Amino acid sequence: TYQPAKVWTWDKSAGGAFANINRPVSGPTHEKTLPVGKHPLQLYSLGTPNGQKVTIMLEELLALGVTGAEYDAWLIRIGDGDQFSSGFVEVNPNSKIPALRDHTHNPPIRVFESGSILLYLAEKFGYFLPQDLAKRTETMNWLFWLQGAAPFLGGGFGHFYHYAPVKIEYAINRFTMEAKRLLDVLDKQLAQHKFVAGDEYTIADMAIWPWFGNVVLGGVYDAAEFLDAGSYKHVQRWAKEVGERPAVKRGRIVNRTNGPLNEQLHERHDASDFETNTEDKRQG
Amino acid sequence: YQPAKVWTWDKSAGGAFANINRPVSGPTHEKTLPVGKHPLQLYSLGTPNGQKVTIMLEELLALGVTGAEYDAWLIRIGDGDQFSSGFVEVNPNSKIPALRDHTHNPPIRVFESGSILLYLAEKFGYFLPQDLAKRTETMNWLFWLQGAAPFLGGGFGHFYHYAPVKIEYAINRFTMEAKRLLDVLDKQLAQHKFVAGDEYTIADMAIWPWFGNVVLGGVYDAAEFLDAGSYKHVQRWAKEVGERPAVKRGRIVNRTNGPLNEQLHERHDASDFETNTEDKRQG
Ligand SMILES: N[C@@H](CCC(=O)N[C@@H](CS)C(=O)NCC(=O)O)C(=O)O
Ligand SMILES: N[C@@H](CCC(=O)N[C@@H](CS)C(=O)NCC(=O)O)C(=O)O
Ligand SMILES: N[C@H](CCC(=O)N[C@@H](CS)C(=O)NCC(=O)O)C(=O)O
Ligand SMILES: N[C@H](CCC(=O)N[C@@H](CS)C(=O)NCC(=O)O)C(=O)O
């Protein structure tokens, strides 16, 4: 019967999902400077649920004509360890996407953590975060909630249900029960409010949709049936409402490398890229 | 064992926190929350997440910010107090800490410890830099904490410490990550006195009760396992922050175990630290 050691040590031979990238130590593995484009915002990211939050926000800002939200979204393949380049570590020492630099300052200001990037963009431009203190505070409560909940959905439920090479009943049960509890909190909130934090769409919706909205629409971990996604009537209503917004349809495909080819735009350097550079146009 | 097509909730599970954990949210009983005389009403327990907030409130009072006066009411999460109707009304997620600011009508509810730290920093104007670069870097680390603690607590703490059955696969996954996060923090503190820069902020208050106390042996009985003495900069900073007068006080609010002089079950007036700690209630 297994007993932990007095002092944990790393077995590099264990293998398994993300074996090639996960380590007990942080920092750079190689020297590479990040590319920088002509736009004021430089984003270094991948179209996972956390990258999508940020590119949905950027697209929503552009739809309101916000010229300062123009951006270059450079692809960082986390499977290849691009997050451990010297250049990437300088923008985010935690080596996770998304990471952004705002080049309208000197020196440029780095922003890492998807939730921090959403708050930074909301404050910078003044949209998608209410002015009223009570409404702003509710919006922040739900944004934080997501930032504290996604780790359970991804690092817990998604890991054990989808990626782990061994199906562990105790861990699947613990993390599926919690993912359901979180969906239930979200469902009972959306029963009473059009959007997560109230009557208006905010950065809280943008943070939550790529995780909880996509999970119930079948888009993450092949888990909608296992999670009984159809039982969360109000999550479904809201996930379809937010998912149909034109800026969400564009934001959700930026830096995306899975799904239908016509729903992948591997980098974004101008608005016209959506017309000409999606992966369905690059098959020859 | 193979997962089902659709997960169903069995009982017969009696593992750690199995008696409070459910796949559904909402109240288990009806009870109103107590309300005291002070402007800020806190409903919490002195776990790492409660301590973030009581530290901030004590730091603000140390600066003479009288509007941070607070009632810190005890919520016993092991008794299901987080599932009363009154508690669900302040935080529909049923976790502590949760706070209401009764200087508004209706009072403004604030839930998630990181949301509370931000709300208080913005309300009073302390512990969140005004310079945009420094402000942004403080928020990066605060959000980093809020996204990292789930792995330290609901992963590492759960599988290493609380679960009586030690599941090697899970313990290796979450220990590795705990150490990676410690190393991030150590490499940052190698270059900076506080987590976000030169000055103490809400980011230190968020991170200390988790990563600071883990390295000092205060959480999960894990310092040896984690090789915590290897993170020299986390140790330096953890000791430096722990010496702060307001940290010494904040860390004991709503604590219900440990030495008697390190337990103040509720805080309802500043003199409670002199009169009403569990050691002083000894007759
Ligand atoms: N708390 C984070 C989590 C970010 C995150 O988990 N990014 C993942 C991809 S979605 C990643 O970069 N993983 C790289 C790795 O684990 O090495 C945030 O909200 O930004
Ligand atoms: N993301 C959270 C987590 C809060 C949390 O995990 N609270 C725990 C105590 S430290 C809790 O109330 N647990 C009660 C339960 O799980 O039923 C926050 O930062 O406030
Ligand atoms: N270090 C990895 C990389 C995979 C990954 O980073 N997953 C992301 C989603 S793409 C995640 O669970 N993020 C948690 C969060 O968003 O807080 C792992 O072993 O789980
Ligand atoms: N629902 C429980 C209760 C235990 C609990 O709430 N743990 C807190 C620490 S006291 C936690 O890990 N919080 C995670 C966070 O702060 O994000 C669990 O099964 O993990």
UniProtKB/Swiss-Prot annotation, chain B:
Ranges for domain GST C-terminal: 134-260
Q: How does it assemble?
A: Homodimer.
Function statement: Exhibits a robust glutathione (GSH)-dependent disulfide-bond reductase activity toward the model substrate, 2-hydroxyethyl disulfide; the actual physiological substrates are not known. Also displays a modest GSH-dependent peroxidase activity toward several organic hydroperoxides, such as cumene hydroperoxide and linoleic acid 13(S)-hydroperoxide, but does not reduce H(2)O(2) or tert-butyl hydroperoxide at appreciable rates.
What's the protein name?
Answer: Disulfide-bond oxidoreductase YghU
Basic and acidic residues bias: start-end ranges: 263-283
User: Any idea which GO molecular function terms this record carries?
Assistant: disulfide oxidoreductase activity; glutathione transferase activity; peroxidase activity; protein homodimerization activity
Q: Which PROSITE patterns match?
A: GST_CTER, GST_NTER
Gene Ontology CC annotations of this record = cytoplasm
- Domain named GST N-terminal: which ranges? 41-128
Output the Pfam families linked to this UniProt entry: GST_C_2 (PF13410), GST_N_2 (PF13409)
**Family, similarity comment:** Belongs to the GST superfamily. Nu-class GSH transferase family.
Q: Where is this region: Disordered?
A: 255-283
Q: Which InterPro entries match?
A: Glutathione-S-Trfase_C-like, Glutathione-S-Trfase_C_sf, Glutathione_S-Trfase, Glutathione_S-Trfase_N, Thioredoxin-like_sf
Positions of glutathione 1 binding: T47, P48, N49, Q82, I96, E112, S113, Q146
Q: What else is known?
A: Binds two molecules of GSH in each active site; there is one tight and one weak binding site for GSH.
Q: What is its EC number?
A: 1.8.4.-, 1.11.1.-
